[PDB]
Amino acid sequence: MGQPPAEEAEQPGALAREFLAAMEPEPAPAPAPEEWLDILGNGLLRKKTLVPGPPGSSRPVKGQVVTVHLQTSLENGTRVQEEPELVFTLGDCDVIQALDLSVPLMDVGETAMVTADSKYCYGPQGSRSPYIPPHAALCLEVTLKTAVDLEHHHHHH
Structure with a gap:
């Protein structure tokens, strides 16, 4: 005996062949x-580790x-922008919010x-080189090469 019989009837009219x-x-x-891992769990903003820190790395704090x-690609793969080094104030939205979070x-x-909806990139904002189409899914590859502490001013509560 092969498999237990769980098939009833014969032909209900149709068959549908291959x-x-x-x-x-x-x-x-x-x-x-x-x-991948959605930063906000919203589905639009996800970070994928190509390499997740070769040495005894450290995650920079917002402020540094x-x-x-x-180098950012479009959702189709078109790399629309490349910048070998962008130093910005983490957490101070000195960049696109997708990046501002992706760094931490x-x-x-x-x-x-990271694939982030243009809304976290340059949706109705547009990018420096190309005004990126609104809610177009941006796929940007970010090398966190350096982090330096330069934020010691003001405070908030």
């Missing part, structure tokens, strides 16, 4: 989850001006590819 088949799941190279290298989520020395 007519249209284009759903064949064959093993594809590069197993990527596609949907950190050097990021970003990044350890020093790592390179994270």
Whole structure:
């Protein structure tokens, strides 16, 4: 005996033969989850560690001006902007909020590819080189190469 019988009836009218088949799941190279860790758990802003800190890294604090290298691709793959070094005030929205958060989520020395909705990038804002289309999903690769402490002014409560 093979399998336990769980099939009742014969033909309810239709049958549907092997007519249209284009759903064949064959093993594809590069197993990527596609949907990574969403920074806000909102679905639009996700950070993927290419490398997550080679040495005994440290995550810069908001306030420290950190050097990021970003080269940003469009959701189709078109890299619209490249900048080998951008030093900005973390947490002070000195950048795109996607990045401003991704850095604290990044350890020093790592390179994270973040896909963030243009709304966290340059949706109705537009990017320096290309005015990035609104709510277009930006995929930016940021190298946190350096972090330096330069924030000791003011306070908030």
